[PDB]
Amino acid sequence: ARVVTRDVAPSNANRSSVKQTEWTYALMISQSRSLGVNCTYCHNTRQFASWKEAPPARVTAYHGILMLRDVNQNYLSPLQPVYPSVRLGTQGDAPKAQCVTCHNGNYKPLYGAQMVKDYPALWG
Amino acid sequence: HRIWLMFDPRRVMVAMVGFLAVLALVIHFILLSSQRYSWIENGTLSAAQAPVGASAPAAAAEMSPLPPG
Amino acid sequence: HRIWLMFDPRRVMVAMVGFLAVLALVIHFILLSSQRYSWIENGTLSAAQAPVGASAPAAAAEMSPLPPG
Amino acid sequence: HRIWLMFDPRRVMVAMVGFLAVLALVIHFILLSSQRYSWIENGTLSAAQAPV
Amino acid sequence: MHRIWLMFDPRRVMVAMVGFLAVLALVIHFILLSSQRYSWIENGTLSAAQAPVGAS
Amino acid sequence: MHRIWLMFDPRRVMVAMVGFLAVLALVIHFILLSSQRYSWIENGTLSAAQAPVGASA
Amino acid sequence: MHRIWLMFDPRRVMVAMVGFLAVLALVIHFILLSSQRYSWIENGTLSAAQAPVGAS
Amino acid sequence: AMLSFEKKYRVRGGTLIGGDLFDFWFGPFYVGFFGVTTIFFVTLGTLLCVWGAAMGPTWNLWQISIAPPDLKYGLGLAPLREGGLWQIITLCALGAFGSWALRQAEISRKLGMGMHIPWAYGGAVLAYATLVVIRPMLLGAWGHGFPYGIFSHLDWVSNVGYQYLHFHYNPAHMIAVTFFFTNCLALAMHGSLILSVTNPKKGTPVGTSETENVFFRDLLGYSIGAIGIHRLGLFLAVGAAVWSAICIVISGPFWTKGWPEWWNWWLNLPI
Amino acid sequence: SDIKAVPADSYNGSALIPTGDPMIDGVGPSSWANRSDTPDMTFHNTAKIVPMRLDPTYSIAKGDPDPRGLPVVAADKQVAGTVIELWVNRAEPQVTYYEVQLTGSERRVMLPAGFVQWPNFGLWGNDKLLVKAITAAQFANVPALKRDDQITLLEEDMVCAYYAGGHLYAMAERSEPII
Amino acid sequence: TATDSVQVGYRGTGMEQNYDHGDLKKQFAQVKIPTPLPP
Amino acid sequence: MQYIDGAQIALYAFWLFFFGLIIYIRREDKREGYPLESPQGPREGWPAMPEKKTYIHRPT
Amino acid sequence: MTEDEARRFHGYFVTGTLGYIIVAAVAHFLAWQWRPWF
Amino acid sequence: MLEYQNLFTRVQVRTVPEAGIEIDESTGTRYGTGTFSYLAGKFGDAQIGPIYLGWAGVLSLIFGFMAFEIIGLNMWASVGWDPVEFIRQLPWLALEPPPPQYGLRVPPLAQGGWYLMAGFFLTISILLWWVRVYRRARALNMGTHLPWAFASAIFLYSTFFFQPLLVGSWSEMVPFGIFPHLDWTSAFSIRYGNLYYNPFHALSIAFLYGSAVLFAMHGATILAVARLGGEREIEQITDRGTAAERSMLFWRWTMGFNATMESIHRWSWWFAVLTTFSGGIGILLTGTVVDNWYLWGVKHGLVAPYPAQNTLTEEQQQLLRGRYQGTAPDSFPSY
Numbered sequence A: 001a002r003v004v005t006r007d008v009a010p011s012n013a014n015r016s017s018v019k020q021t022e023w024t025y026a027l028m029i030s031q032s033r034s035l036g037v038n039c040t041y042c043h044n045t046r047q048f049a050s051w052k053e054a055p056p057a058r059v060t061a062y063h064g065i066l067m068l069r070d071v072n073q074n075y076l077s078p079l080q081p082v083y084p085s086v087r088l089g090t091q092g093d094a095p096k097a098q099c100v101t102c103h104n105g106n107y108k109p110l111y112g113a114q115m116v117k118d119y120p121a122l123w124g
Numbered sequence B, C: 001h002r003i004w005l006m007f008d009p010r011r012v013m014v015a016m017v018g019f020l021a022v023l024a025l026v027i028h029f030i031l032l033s034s035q036r037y038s039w040i041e042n043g044t045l046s047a048a049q050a051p052v053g054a055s056a057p058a059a060a061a062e063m064s065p066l067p068p069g
Numbered sequence D: 001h002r003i004w005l006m007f008d009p010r011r012v013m014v015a016m017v018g019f020l021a022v023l024a025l026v027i028h029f030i031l032l033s034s035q036r037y038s039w040i041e042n043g044t045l046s047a048a049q050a051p052v
Numbered sequence E, G: 001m002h003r004i005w006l007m008f009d010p011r012r013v014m015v016a017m018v019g020f021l022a023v024l025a026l027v028i029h030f031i032l033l034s035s036q037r038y039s040w041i042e043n044g045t046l047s048a049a050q051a052p053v054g055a056s
Numbered sequence F: 001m002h003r004i005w006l007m008f009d010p011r012r013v014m015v016a017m018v019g020f021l022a023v024l025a026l027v028i029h030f031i032l033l034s035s036q037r038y039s040w041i042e043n044g045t046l047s048a049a050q051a052p053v054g055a056s057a
Numbered sequence H: 001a002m003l004s005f006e007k008k009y010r011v012r013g014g015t016l017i018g019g020d021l022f023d024f025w026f027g028p029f030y031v032g033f034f035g036v037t038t039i040f041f042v043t044l045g046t047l048l049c050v051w052g053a054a055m056g057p058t059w060n061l062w063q064i065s066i067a068p069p070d071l072k073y074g075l076g077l078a079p080l081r082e083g084g085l086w087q088i089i090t091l092c093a094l095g096a097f098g099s100w101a102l103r104q105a106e107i108s109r110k111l112g113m114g115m116h117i118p119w120a121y122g123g124a125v126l127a128y129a130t131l132v133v134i135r136p137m138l139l140g141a142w143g144h145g146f147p148y149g150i151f152s153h154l155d156w157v158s159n160v161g162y163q164y165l166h167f168h169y170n171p172a173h174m175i176a177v178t179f180f181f182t183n184c185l186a187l188a189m190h191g192s193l194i195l196s197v198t199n200p201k202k203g204t205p206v207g208t209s210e211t212e213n214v215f216f217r218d219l220l221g222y223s224i225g226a227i228g229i230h231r232l233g234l235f236l237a238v239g240a241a242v243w244s245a246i247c248i249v250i251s252g253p254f255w256t257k258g259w260p261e262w263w264n265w266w267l268n269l270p271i
Numbered sequence I: 001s002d003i004k005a006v007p008a009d010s011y012n013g014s015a016l017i018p019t020g021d022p023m024i025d026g027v028g029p030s031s032w033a034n035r036s037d038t039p040d041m042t043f044h045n046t047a048k049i050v051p052m053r054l055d056p057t058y059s060i061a062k063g064d065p066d067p068r069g070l071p072v073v074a075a076d077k078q079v080a081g082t083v084i085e086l087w088v089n090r091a092e093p094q095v096t097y098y099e100v101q102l103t104g105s106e107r108r109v110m111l112p113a114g115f116v117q118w119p120n121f122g123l124w125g126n127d128k129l130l131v132k133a134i135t136a137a138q139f140a141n142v143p144a145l146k147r148d149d150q151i152t153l154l155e156e157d158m159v160c161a162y163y164a165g166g167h168l169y170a171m172a173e174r175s176e177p178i179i
Numbered sequence J: 001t002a003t004d005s006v007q008v009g010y011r012g013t014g015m016e017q018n019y020d021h022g023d024l025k026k027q028f029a030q031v032k033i034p035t036p037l038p039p
Numbered sequence K: 001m002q003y004i005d006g007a008q009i010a011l012y013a014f015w016l017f018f019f020g021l022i023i024y025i026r027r028e029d030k031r032e033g034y035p036l037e038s039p040q041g042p043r044e045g046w047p048a049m050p051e052k053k054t055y056i057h058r059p060t
Numbered sequence L: 001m002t003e004d005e006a007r008r009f010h011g012y013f014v015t016g017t018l019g020y021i022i023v024a025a026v027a028h029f030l031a032w033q034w035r036p037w038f
Numbered sequence M: 001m002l003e004y005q006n007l008f009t010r011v012q013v014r015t016v017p018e019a020g021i022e023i024d025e026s027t028g029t030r031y032g033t034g035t036f037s038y039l040a041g042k043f044g045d046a047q048i049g050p051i052y053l054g055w056a057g058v059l060s061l062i063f064g065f066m067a068f069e070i071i072g073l074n075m076w077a078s079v080g081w082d083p084v085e086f087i088r089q090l091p092w093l094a095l096e097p098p099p100p101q102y103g104l105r106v107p108p109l110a111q112g113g114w115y116l117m118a119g120f121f122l123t124i125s126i127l128l129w130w131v132r133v134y135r136r137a138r139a140l141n142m143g144t145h146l147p148w149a150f151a152s153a154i155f156l157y158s159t160f161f162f163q164p165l166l167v168g169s170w171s172e173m174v175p176f177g178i179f180p181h182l183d184w185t186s187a188f189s190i191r192y193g194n195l196y197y198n199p200f201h202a203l204s205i206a207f208l209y210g211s212a213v214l215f216a217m218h219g220a221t222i223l224a225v226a227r228l229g230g231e232r233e234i235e236q237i238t239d240r241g242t243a244a245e246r247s248m249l250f251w252r253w254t255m256g257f258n259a260t261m262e263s264i265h266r267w268s269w270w271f272a273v274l275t276t277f278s279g280g281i282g283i284l285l286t287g288t289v290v291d292n293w294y295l296w297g298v299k300h301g302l303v304a305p306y307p308a309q310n311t312l313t314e315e316q317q318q319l320l321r322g323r324y325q326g327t328a329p330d331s332f333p334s335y
């Protein structure tokens, strides 16, 4: 999803369009609304590409992407043939998860409630 | 009765009607925006089933409505 | 004709020239943006090699980086 | 004929020409945007193979 | 009821009526065109039994 | 009863009445069209038993 | 036929004609330069059988 | 020094505070009580700004930044090294701007002019006060103000704008932007019109007031008056600042979500 | 030589103090610029500012109160006269002056339209002409015109300057500070 | 209406999170954690 | 070279043009009311006084 | 503009319109030979 | 109670409508006779007078209406020709530029061809309107100051064509839409690294604010001396009265220096023109000379230091590296 150039001068290393930047903007607006936060929660908007100027939450957010890519690829999607047709989509595919599935508009799920510490069967 | 020689009754009546109407609208809308007196939705409930604001509450553990500073 | 008594030829000539210019430009541009009649690129194709029936609202990819060009 | 004493023929004809040109442009555009009547690309298809 | 024309100018009345009628006709035609049942440009050749119907 | 027209211009009253009536008719027709039960362009061929009904309690 | 010059000022007509012709020439040259087949500054040395052709 | 016609206008009277003591001219400047107060506040604020630059890591003009305090000191005067200096500088700036407006009022009361200029400057003063006083008070902390730095206050603007996801969707911001753009357009038109009439095609005489109206009527179909253009320019320029103050004061105190979502009301109209 | 104003002290930058009456002497906000002693002209070489009686084509827009025959209340809440004629600007059509007949009549004075305020900002009943600058007694000192059909630029400036200077020199509390 | 603000960046940068107090309280109150089962 | 780039060069060209423009407009600002009145004599700031300018009037 | 001037202008306008209008017909026939659209 | 503030006019004076100064009418003529608006006459002049129409104006109207029609019809087609959705969703609708992979080659009609047609017609009509402004100015023997201010506006407008051509893609152009063109503004700033650090963007912002400052100052000054005949600025320029003298002295006593009645309009003209000129330069420099304005600002010492908000480990720096955005998936995979 990166669009910003790591140089002062243009080159062929980055040829991102303004349209791709708009796509990233839409995805990040969705992420912000899924956590009930604004852009400055994970960004210093004076330079969106910087990780050192951004709060640590950004690092966490990136891992939340990777986890989702695993969950949606290896657990939820392969469950396509199990669901009845009323559960699938208009293309007949299994439902998938996003950030708001756990977060439901909060910076932490259930405001950071701890529940699995008292249920060892769910630990990994 | 000599108060009316001090202020024009036309102006006083205009200000009175305007202020009283604005106050009535504001009170009705404050009540309608509340939880206990949202009468259009929950007006059929009895006085015992109507919502009541929470009393002196207790604390919580490892749970914050606000993100850390 | 009497149409020139109601309408001065001086003004209607300019309006007519402008209308014909905009219409010809519109049609040439529409043809240039079509697959079948993009003559600058595919004008050398014969009538049997020309594309047919290629409306396809998403005929090309919408999202991509810029080319090296 | 006496309508033309109540309305200026010049203004009526200018309004008619403008409205009719705009209407023709709008109809040709709607047809061109459709799938069944996109004649620049579809025109050589027979009626049976035209989209529905 | 001809005396209405003595209260209202026929010219302005007819202009306003023509404008309102044209706008209304355009709005109805486009409401029909945008619907699923009455597109008539894509699905006009469909019969009344094959035309879409709203969900029950 | 007909003295009302001596306080209000009938020409300026009929125009306002027509405008208000047209606006009100358009607003009601559009509210009905934007609803689910009375979207008559699509579901107008349904019977009264097949027409949508809003969620109950 | 020459009488048209009594209806239209030759000076204005020539200025407008020259402006239109220059704009048209620049637009055509630019359209050709932006194309693949006729981008002559880069690929003008190709033979007619080597020049790009649109998809068949 | 003095202009050729200046001497007859330099008289006594028109001041609001003080008498013959503060009724003199220092060079071209007029000094009143509010001139003295303006000098006091300007000197103190500028010296404190230089001290804030000295406390910081650089003397570079673009990189100097005196920042407001943390939000945890809400509405209290923070320690000087932790944002209190910003608060003192803000007090100095408020005093200086008020004194400038009142001194302008004294000057206009002395030349027989109207009171328009101080009130026009009051719009900008109100915008600044909304930025550093009204909005931080409604939000409950002085740390909601912007830092005093040439490029650091741009960073503050950027982050505050992205606090509402897409700040372009603020309706009052859209109205204020329209006011600014229309003001620039109208200023260009007015300057061009006056210059073109007083500096016409070479060889032709200076145009009249009817030429302006005839030109703009020929071009646009309507020509506002000579007084009308100045009224419109004043209204546009001042309304830009007023609508800016409105747009910033509703973000946070009244709206805390993303601005695009605010347009739900338009999509949910009953029609 | 014509600056009837003595310096307050010898320190440079000091304010001047008028000796006689500033309004007619022409110092401070009562001063005027020496413009040409010829009338202001239109595009067609006609007098730009003329009374309505000299041009019947002009009129008053329907909906606006007619100021003629209205009392002119002065700064001291004293009626100084009555409006009898309107001078209009022919190049740009607007009300520019009000001709006021004095209480004792026998003369007329010119009143700039920019110094005229209407009651309730011209929203409610407009039955008097408010002039806050000059009091009723000073209307008799407004400089007279050479003719009654045209007004030169010099007289224009003189009348405007006289009216403007009374925002500081009408009463004694006006040139004095508020504290 | 009070706004709860949480500072997430350096002072003066404008990096803050705003919340409307009333809706935040209502949203937090409505959450009901199931009680942990006895071990 | 490396530190110098096109944006910097264009910026300094703009600065030069802007200073020239400010000089020209200040020259125009002194077309009325000059030279100044001072005990030391006539005074002219920088830029100095411009030449006298006269307008054109239509004949009568 | 008199009636005779309108007659004289109409003659030239009609002949120029005809020539233009179906020199366009020749163009359309050439384009149809090259690549028919129906 | 209050002094007359010259904000609104209470007594309007009517007369025969002004036909206009005699001008050449060989290529165009004036239409209308001149009507009066009372509400318009409250604030300024009241005459909705005749309007001149000639060759350039008619041609500009035709081309501009064609562009407007193309934009509107594409917007209408994007909602499925629904008039209710057309009105309800109007601020969100757009006519979108072509895809990035076409570069400068002509795109398909439904994927950017209409956009280029509309842009071309709008450009032609804007240039023809410039010609009309120039001719209206020269018909009255006026100077051409307004044409050359409109030229600065057109220069900024034309950078929205020239910068996408210089970077090499029509996809980078501004979409025709109320909200979407604001979306493009935001995404343009983000893509090229915080346009706040573009020096010419800062310059143009300075000139825009200065235009607001100058118009507020000039309008307040003229309104404050309108009681002395100050609004008639032509005569105050050719024969300096007491209003111009007081206007000069106010600002001389206030800020130590002043302008004249004529040169304040030079100040205004140049501030307004420079607003668009420096902005156009700034846009032309973006993506062709500088690709990251924040990094250019760091290079030239524009960026203030802040304490680090996060520190990354050696493995985190390799892990947190991402990938540049590519193309969208054209398949719906089954897992």
Ligand SMILES: CCCCCCCCCCCCCC(=O)OC[C@H](COP(=O)(O)OCC(O)COP(=O)(O)OC[C@@H](COC(=O)CCCCCCCCCCCCC)OC(=O)CCCCCCCCCCCCC)OC(=O)CCCCCCCCCCCCC
Residues within 6 Å of the ligand: H001, H024, H025, H026, H027, H028, H031, H035, H036, H039, H040, H043, I011, I012, I013, I014, M256
């Ligand atoms: C950006 C572009 C730049 C651009 C810079 C370059 C261009 C500047 C252009 C300025 C305008 C045109 C020139 C002009 O006319 O100037 C006025 C004056 C001539 O005045 P005048 O025509 O004689 O009129 C004076 C008249 O009113 C009589 O005044 P008087 O002499 O009676 O006293 C008036 C003042 C001064 O009082 C004094 O006693 C003066 C001597 C002592 C001064 C210091 C006293 C304080 C203690 C010691 C401090 C110092 C101890 C070390 O009296 C007043 O009341 C007026 C002043 C305000 C008082 C209230 C405020 C009090 C608190 C002040 C705190 C801060 C100041 C200390 O001219 C001159 O002095 C000529 C030389 C130029 C002076 C400015 C030079 C600035 C250099 C800056 C270098 C660095 C630049 C970055």
Ligand SMILES: CCCCCCCCCCCCCC(=O)OC[C@H](COP(=O)(O)OCC(O)COP(=O)(O)OC[C@@H](COC(=O)CCCCCCCCCCCCC)OC(=O)CCCCCCCCCCCCC)OC(=O)CCCCCCCCCCCCC
Residues within 6 Å of the ligand: H195, H199, H200, H201, H202, K016, K017, K019, K020, K021, K024, M142, M143, M144, M145, M148, M149, M151, M152, M154, M155, M277
């Ligand atoms: C779409 C794309 C475009 C997008 C961007 C577009 C930007 C447009 C910028 C336009 C700048 C001028 C604006 C303006 O006032 O226009 C009005 C005027 C029409 O006036 P008119 O209709 O003829 O009216 C006659 C009369 O009323 C004019 O009086 P006005 O007061 O309006 O103008 C005053 C004149 C007085 O002229 C002089 O005194 C003669 C000397 C002027 C300076 C010559 C050298 C300039 C530098 C050259 C190298 C410049 C190198 C950059 O003054 C002016 O019009 C401008 C006064 C100066 C403005 C500031 C200059 C600052 C220079 C600083 C330089 C650095 C110092 C360190 O229009 C003109 O074009 C006037 C000039 C006409 C004569 C031709 C000049 C150029 C000849 C060489 C090129 C020939 C064609 C290839």
Ligand code: BCL
Residues within 6 Å of the ligand: H157, H181, M064, M067, M068, M071, M122, M126, M153, M154, M156, M157, M184, M185, M186, M188, M189, M194, M195, M196, M198, M200, M201, M204, M205, M206, M208, M275, M276, M278, M279, M280, M282, M283
């Ligand atoms: C997140 C968003 C970005 C940002 C992105 C941009 C971009 C991108 C641009 C600007 C530009 C500008 N920005 Mg910004 N900007 C931001 C923050 C700001 C802030 C602020 C307080 O934060 C301010 C005050 C500004 C102010 C400014 C202006 C000085 C400047 C535009 C002048 C202008 O438009 O004149 C108005 C004039 C025009 C638009 C010229 C064209 C007018 C044409 C000729 C009119 C034709 C009309 C036509 C005929 C009408 C009919 C059409 C129908 C369809 C037929 N920016 C942040 C950093 N800004 C521009 C610039 O120059 O940047 C260097 C620019 O392109």
Ligand SMILES: CC[C@H]1c2cc3[nH]c4c(c3C)C(=O)[C@H](C(=O)OC)c4c3nc(cc4[nH]c(cc(n2)[C@@H]1C)c(C(C)=O)c4C)[C@@H](C)[C@@H]3CCC(=O)OC/C=C(\C)CCC[C@H](C)CCC[C@H](C)CCCC(C)C
Residues within 6 Å of the ligand: H041, H042, H045, H046, H049, H089, H092, H093, H096, H097, H100, H117, H120, H121, H123, H124, H147, H148, H149, H150, H153, H237, H238, H239, H240, H241, M209, M212, M213, M216, M217, M220, M254, M255
């Ligand atoms: C109608 C509102 C618009 C407007 C109008 C306006 N401005 C005005 C006026 C008017 C009508 C004046 O008459 C007045 C004036 O006298 O101008 C010459 C003024 C003025 N507008 C000014 C600037 C200005 N106006 C701005 C805005 C606008 N002004 C609005 C768009 C801006 C913007 C947008 O940023 C600026 C920078 C000044 C030139 C002048 C007011 C002069 C003044 O107040 O001087 C007293 C102060 C000093 C001499 C020095 C500062 C003293 C402080 C204590 C120092 C500390 C400042 C603080 C640290 C802030 C740092 C900010 C950082 C971001 C850099």
Ligand SMILES: CC[C@H]1c2cc3[nH]c4c(c3C)C(=O)[C@H](C(=O)OC)c4c3nc(cc4[nH]c(cc(n2)[C@@H]1C)c(C(C)=O)c4C)[C@@H](C)[C@@H]3CCC(=O)OC/C=C(\C)CCC[C@H](C)CCC[C@H](C)CCCC(C)C
Residues within 6 Å of the ligand: H181, H182, H184, H185, H188, H189, H219, H220, M060, M061, M064, M065, M068, M122, M125, M126, M127, M129, M130, M133, M146, M147, M149, M150, M152, M153, M272, M273, M275, M276
């Ligand atoms: C100094 C820079 C500033 C500036 C200057 C400037 N602009 C100028 C000028 C100047 C000096 C002119 O001379 C010129 C002008 O004439 O102004 C009055 C112009 C102009 N500035 C304009 C706009 C404008 N200026 C802007 C900006 C600015 N202009 C800068 C701030 C902006 C912004 C902020 O984006 C805009 C939008 C125009 C008013 C005008 C140029 C007009 C032009 O080129 O027109 C071409 C004609 C058309 C496109 C025809 C369109 C027809 C209709 C719009 C559509 C059809 C409508 C239909 C008939 C009815 C409605 C629909 C129905 C379904 C109901």
Ligand SMILES: CC(C)=CCC/C(C)=C/CC/C(C)=C/CC/C(C)=C/CC/C(C)=C/CC/C(C)=C/CC/C(C)=C/CC/C(C)=C/CC1=C(C)C(=O)c2ccccc2C1=O
Residues within 6 Å of the ligand: H036, H037, H038, H040, H041
């Ligand atoms: C009835 C009704 C419906 C009302 C609703 C209205 C509502 C609700 C409004 C909100 C109310 C609230 C709570 C808001 C707070 C508003 C406040 C705090 C009001 C402030 C009042 C006010 C008039 C503002 C400033 C007061 C002024 C102008 C002070 C000047 C005092 C004065 C004349 C003294 C001179 C000394 C000054 C000014 C000090 C500065 C100064 C100092 C300190 C020197 O040492 C010095 C030394 C040598 C030379 C100069 C100076 C110098 O300038």
Ligand SMILES: CC(C)=CCC/C(C)=C\CC/C(C)=C/CC/C(C)=C\CC/C(C)=C\CC/C(C)=C\CC/C(C)=C/CC/C(C)=C/CC1=C(C)C(=O)c2ccccc2C1=O
Residues within 6 Å of the ligand: H182, H185, H186, H189, H190, H191, H193, H194, H212, H213, H216, H220, H222, H223, H224, H225, H226, H229, H232, H235, M002, M005, M007, M043
């Ligand atoms: C006690 C007390 C507080 C009272 C004081 C009063 C108060 C409260 C303060 C002010 C508050 C008030 C009353 C404000 C409300 C104002 C109102 C009612 C609104 C006005 C809105 C309005 C007039 C219009 C909106 C403007 C908009 C949106 C668009 C502008 C478009 C535009 C570019 C217009 C320009 C028009 C034209 C054609 C001008 C060209 C033109 C120019 C540019 C010239 O230079 C010139 C010079 C000389 C002759 C001719 C001309 C000329 O006509």
Ligand SMILES: COC(C)(C)C/C=C/C(C)=C/C=C/C(C=O)=C/C=C/C(C)=C/C=C/C=C(C)/C=C/C=C(\C)CC/C=C(C)/C=C/C=C(\C)C(=O)O
Residues within 6 Å of the ligand: C002, C003, C005, C006, D016, D020, D026, D027, D030, E022, E025, E026, E029, E030, E033
């Ligand atoms: C997807 O589809 C959607 C769009 C959704 C569905 C659409 C629906 C709608 C609403 C459609 C609307 C249709 C409509 C509206 O009413 C249609 C109305 C059509 C009409 C009225 C057409 C009229 C045409 C008239 C013409 C051409 C006249 C020509 C006249 C000529 C040539 C005479 C010339 C004059 C002369 C020579 C005089 C000489 C001078 C003389 C003698 C002198 O000077 O004396």
Ligand SMILES: COC(C)(C)C/C=C/C(C)=C/C=C/C(C=O)=C/C=C/C(C)=C/C=C/C=C(C)/C=C/C=C(\C)CC/C=C(C)/C=C/C=C(\C)C(=O)O
Residues within 6 Å of the ligand: C023, C026, C027, C030, D021, D024, D025, D028, D029, G001, G003, G004, G007, L005, L008, L009, L012, L013, L014, L016, L017, L020, L021
């Ligand atoms: C992609 O599909 C989309 C586009 C979407 C679908 C769209 C479809 C639409 C809407 C099409 C519209 C078509 C249309 C109608 O609207 C088309 C109308 C065409 C017409 C009528 C063309 C007429 C041209 C006339 C010409 C060139 C005349 C020339 C005359 C000449 C040279 C003589 C002049 C010289 C003279 C006189 C000198 C003598 C003077 C003398 C003696 C003197 O002066 O005295």
Ligand SMILES: COC(C)(C)C/C=C/C(C)=C/C=C/C(C)=C/C=C/C(C)=C/C=C\C=C(C)\C=C\C=C(C)\C=C\C=C(C)\C=C\CC(C)(C)OC
Residues within 6 Å of the ligand: G027, G030, G031, M068, M069, M071, M072, M073, M075, M076, M106, M116, M117, M119, M120, M123, M157, M158, M160, M161, M173, M174, M175, M176, M177, M178, M181
């Ligand atoms: C009733 O409904 C109908 C449809 C009949 C009429 C209604 C129409 C409506 C409702 C229209 C609405 C229009 C709106 C809302 C428009 C909004 C426009 C906005 C906000 C635009 C903002 C910015 C756009 C910019 C800056 C665009 C610039 C484009 C440029 C510079 C394009 C240049 C293109 C060129 C020169 C193309 C050349 C062609 C080449 C040479 C490339 O040919 C190959």
Ligand SMILES: CCCCCCCCCCCCO[C@@H]1O[C@H](CO)[C@@H](O[C@H]2O[C@H](CO)[C@@H](O)[C@H](O)[C@H]2O)[C@H](O)[C@H]1O
Residues within 6 Å of the ligand: H119, H122, H123, H126, H175, H238, H239, H242
């Ligand atoms: C599309 C929606 C409509 C857009 C147009 C809206 C037009 C009206 C809004 C612009 C004018 C607002 O009018 C505004 O009135 C307020 C009073 O409330 C005036 O007063 C305001 O600023 C002054 C300036 O110091 C302050 O002293 C005062 O406390 C403050 O209220 C403003 O000076 C004036 O600008």
Ligand SMILES: [Fe+3]
Residues within 6 Å of the ligand: H190, H194, M218, M222, M233, M265
């Ligand atoms: Fe002006």
